[PDB]
Amino acid sequence: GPGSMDNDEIFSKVRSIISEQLDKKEDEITTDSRFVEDLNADSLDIYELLYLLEEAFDDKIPENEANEFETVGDVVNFIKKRKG
Incomplete structure (x- = not known):
């Protein structure tokens, strides 16, 4: 199946870095996560x-x-196509 392109490599590569400490999956993209859950900090x-x-x-x-x-x-899919 598809799923091989820089488009899905930008958000994946970036997450691959935080994944170290976050120990989470980049496929956790959801509105019920936000920076609080996804990121290791607050919107501040x-x-x-x-x-x-x-x-x-x-x-x-x-x-x-x-x-x-x-x-x-939203930001994920945004920066993904924004840069491509």
């Missing part, structure tokens, strides 16, 4: 994380991303 620290991340792509988070933003799952 994530604020600057995404804030600076969007600056690298030149796009408003609460404006552009807001079009379809909700939880980590």
Whole structure:
């Protein structure tokens, strides 16, 4: 079956790093996880994380991303296609 491309390698590769400490699966993408469950911190620290991340792509988070933003799952599929 399919599933072989940089598209599904970006979110996977990135998660492969945190997976060490997080010891979680990248397939845990869900709105019931958020940074609290998925990430090892709170949105407090994530604020600057995404804030600076969007600056690298030149796009408003609460404006552009807001079009379809909700939880980590959204950012995953977002940065996935955003870069490809």
